[PDB]
Amino acid sequence: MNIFEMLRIDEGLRLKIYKDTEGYYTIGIGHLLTKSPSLNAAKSELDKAIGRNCNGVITKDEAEKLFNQDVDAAVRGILRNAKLKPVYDSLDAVRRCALINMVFQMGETGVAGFTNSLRMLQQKRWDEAAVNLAKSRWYNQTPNRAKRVITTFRTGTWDAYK
Ligand SMILES: [Cl-]
Ligand SMILES: [Cl-]
């Protein structure tokens, strides 16, 4: 199991503009297009992203191209972040995937706000970090996805995805 397979389970694949759990316009494998209410702004952002007129629809290939970019951006973002980088460096490979997951869903800024959790992960206090991560809007809003990521941090295995 790898990051791509993990995120593909958590995000799904959709070939037409859709709205995310939050109500924002998204396409492909969790690729956020815009927070603006306009479907029009969304279609425009899409054309911009693909370099062509898409009229709200994309191919799988396009979906995967965007997915490669997003995961790359997530990883580079963590490695250039003062708060995130040390956490990431201290973790084993599986738990590294779980941090990437969070960053991809919630952005670098979002994750960096989980101060106390990050601190406990750095210290390898698995059970305690698990309890603290669940005390969040994140958990309350997408509890099954949150549980899966949380379990990955707790155990250091792919069991939640398996
Ligand atoms: Cl883009
Ligand atoms: Cl969920």
Distance 73 CA to ligand 1 centre (A): 10
Instruction: Give the integer Cα–Cα distance in Å for 35 and 133.
Output: 25
Closest CA to 81 of 127, 59, 113, 50: 113
Distance 137 CA to ligand 2 centre (A): 12
- 132 marked ligand binding residue: yes
Are 2 and 10 in contact, with CB atoms under 8 Å apart? no
- 104 marked ligand binding residue: yes
Closest CA to 49 of 65, 38, 73: 65
Domains and CATH numbers, the chain: 1-162 (1.10.530.40)
Q: How far apart are the first and last CA of the chain?
A: 9
Distance 120 CA to ligand 1 centre (A): 33
Place of tokens 């389970």: 9
- Nearest bound ligand to CA 72? 1
Handedness of CA 23, 84, 158, 27 (dihedral sign): positive
Task: Give the determination technique.
Answer: X-ray
Q: For residue 71, which amino acid is it?
A: V
Write b or e for each residue in 18-45: b if 16 or more Cβ atoms lie within 10 A of its Cβ, otherwise e: eebeeeebbbbbbbbbbeeeeeeebbeb
Q: Which of 5, 10, 11, 64 is catalytic?
A: 11
In the chain, the largest separation of any two C-alpha atoms, in whole Å, equals 49
Q: In what order do the strands lie in the sheet with 25-28?
A: 14-19, 25-28, 31-34
CA separation (Å) from 115 to 80, 103, 121, 122?
A: 17, 14, 10, 11
**3-state DSSP assignment of residue 2:** coil
CA separation (Å) from 107 to 15, 44, 78, 114, 138?
A: 23, 22, 10, 12, 12
**Residue 124 CB contacts under 8 Å (≥ 6 apart), including other chains:** 90
